[PDB]
């Protein structure tokens, strides 16, 4: 299974840095015991040398994560940005990905990474839904994401 609470979705204000984004999306996981207290710095350390920018066609998506040993329980944290924030390209292109949707992943097994990129494929697939993510409010984004990912893996 994987834990997905209502407070794991959050809109972020403008003028936020890449570190403040990661720190903000890790606070619910730290407060719920899903990860170690140092989980924010470990994700910042990985993103610096292993970026996770994905140039999705509608809006840019980022998937910051870290190794499994700093994760207690499986969970995802979703953050909607007010302005595009650059995450350097995970592909290898010299230019970054303007990201507006951030998925903070905390999986307990490295070999499940390929399976969690597949869950995000189910959210990314709908172009119209990615547009609605930027206009919906907090509880609207939670209900839509919960049911869309609930169609396969167990949640909460």
């Amino acid at each position, epitope marked *: 299974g994987i834990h997905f609470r209502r407070h794991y979705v959050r809109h972020l204000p403008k003028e936020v840095s890449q570190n403040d984004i990661i720190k903000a999306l890790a606070s619910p996981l730290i407060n719920d015991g899903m990860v170690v207290s140092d989980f924010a710095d470990h994700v910042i350390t990985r993103e610096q040398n*292993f970026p*996770t920018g994905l140039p999705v066609e509608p809006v840019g998506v980022a*998937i910051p994560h870290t*190794d*499994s*040993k700093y994760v207690r329980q499986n969970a995802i944290s979703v953050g909607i940005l007010a302005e595009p924030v650059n995450f350097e390209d*995970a*592909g*290898g292109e010299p230019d970054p990905v303007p990201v507006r949707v951030v998925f903070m992943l905390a999986l307990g*097994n*490295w*070999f*499940d*990474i*390929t*399976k969690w*990129l*597949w869950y995000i*494929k*189910a959210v990314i*697939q709908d172009e119209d839904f990615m547009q609605q993510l930027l206009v919906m409010n907090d509880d609207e984004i939670y209900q839509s994401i919960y049911t869309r990912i609930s169609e*396969l893996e167990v949640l909460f």
Partner: antibody
Amino acid sequence: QVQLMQSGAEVKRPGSSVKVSCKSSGGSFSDYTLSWVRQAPGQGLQWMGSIVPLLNLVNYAQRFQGRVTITADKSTSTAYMELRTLRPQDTAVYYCAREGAEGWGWFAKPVGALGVWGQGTTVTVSS
Amino acid sequence: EIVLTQSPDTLSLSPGERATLSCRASQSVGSSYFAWYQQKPGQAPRLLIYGASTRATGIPGRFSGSGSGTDFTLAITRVEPEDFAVYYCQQFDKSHVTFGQGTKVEFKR
């Protein structure tokens, strides 16, 4: 669905290096993990490392302690395996393997286990 | 790491008997992270069972995996001449992969 084609057999002296390649076929190259498993003549299977090309994330068997380097060339859909400072006991058949997937196409659900295997590359280390 | 111990080393039976292979783990492995493989002489291994109990595509119904925690079992209901080979169990639960030593299923005459 997917075919894994590896490079030919290689003969190397002790202390040298081996770079085994593995070209993928029909199916998403970057979305699924590529693993390298070797097998000494008459013995069992030993995992060496895995890689996810989309994120360029590589996970190694810590017993090799840096002797192994696994890279992926996304443009040509080829994964590489480099084993340095070879010993005679490194003589084995080196297999390229892709994780299995439930379904077809871009929405094939990753499975974890190795469902697609390469034909294997014989590496002989001797003077 | 998680050590996998297979039993028995060799299984000697005639075609038509039931074949039961056991794989014991030193730590608990999640069922989603367990798999069985078959290898014939000269060929690469082939995936039989994944997720501890799910058959791979094209694997006949006479193969059935089961078990959880630390005890996993592979069963072959009616062994056939093309089922005689070496079977390896595999886990990949805690970010690392280990295999069993292998069980050779041989034709008993």
